[PDB]
Design a protein around this ligand. Structure first.
Ligand SMILES: CN[C@@H]1CCc2c(ccc(O)c2O)[C@H]1O
Length: 284
């Protein structure tokens, strides 16, 4: 019906607009002002770059493919799109992992933070993260190593309209392990100790002078990442392990839920008063 196609297009355009506007302002504010060029603001720059690439490339063409129902572009041009999707998702999650580790290294070892993070080490860390993300998205896909053998997969591969995702078991497990689960475990172990230290400091202060803030901040941090990406990475292995228990539509919906996370990062991370002033003088 014409109601559905017009109605969904508005949402799929608002998502792109929100992502682009949110992720361009942070980059502009960091670049144009010498106050915010901190060693810990480069990771946010990399995260914003990944989110911007997602907004410019991943979302609009997927929306057009869904609305039109046929991939009018060539067969070559959409393997590039799939590789871009995987690369951007991996580089976005691993950047959050790196930010968490950097935050951990500053509280438990206050006397060594300035002498163990340096502007030279940040570049190396970012380059390693992006390289690791790049050797799990372009190399294994454009070499045609992930393709399945079942009849539907080949019958759809041999058509210039088909670009639906059919993946092998080993790739489906390895990609998920590299992208999500190891960063999830690392982030959990990192963020438990920060809460423990906050509790210790509060208890130490209370005795001498005589915590909703810690729970609220950690909830905002870890209830938007464990709720947006976890449901997808549980079915990403399930639909491969056991026959066809998972429908294609549920897979697609849980995938598009994960793209929305790219539009929330500036709100979660760029809330400091310095960022507020920087945004205020950029506009208005
Ligand atoms: C086209 N959508 C892709 C399909 C599979 C996949 C995604 C993201 C990270 C991964 O590690 C994946 O294996 C999704 O963004």
């Amino acid at each position: 019906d014409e109601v559905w196609v017009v109605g969904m297009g508005i949402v799929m355009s608002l998502i792109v607009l929100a992502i682009v506007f949110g992720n361009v302002l942070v980059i502009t504010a960091i670049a144009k002002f010498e106050r915010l060029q901190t060693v810990t603001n480069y990771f946010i720059t990399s995260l914003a770059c990944a989110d911007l690439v997602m907004g410019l490339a991943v979302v609009p063409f997927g929306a057009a493919h869904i609305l039109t129902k046929t991939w009018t572009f060539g067969n070559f041009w959409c393997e590039f799109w799939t590789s871009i999707d995987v690369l951007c998702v991996t580089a976005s999650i691993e950047t959050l992992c790196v930010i968490a580790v950097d935050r951990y290294f500053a509280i438990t070892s206050p006397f060594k933070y300035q002498s163990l993070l340096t502007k030279n080490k940040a570049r190396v860390i970012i380059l390693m993260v992006w390289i690791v993300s790049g050797l799990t998205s372009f190399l294994p896909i454009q070499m045609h190593w992930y393709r399945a053998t079942h009849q539907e997969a080949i019958n759809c591969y041999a058509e210039e309209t088909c670009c639906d995702f059919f993946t092998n078991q080993a790739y489906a497990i390895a990609s998920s392990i590299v992208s999500f689960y190891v960063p999830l475990v690392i982030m959990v172990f990192v963020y438990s100790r920060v809460f423990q230290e906050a509790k210790r400091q509060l208890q130490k202060i209370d005795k001498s002078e005589g915590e909703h803030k810690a729970l609220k901040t950690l909830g905002i941090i870890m209830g938007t990442f464990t709720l947006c990406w976890l449901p997808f990475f549980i079915v990403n292995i399930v639909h491969v392990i056991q026959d066809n228990l998972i429908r294609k539509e549920v897979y697609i919906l849980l995938n598009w839920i994960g793209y929305v996370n790219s539009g929330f990062n500036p709100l979660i991370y760029c809330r400091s008063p310095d960022f507020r002033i920087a945004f205020q003088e950029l506009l208005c």
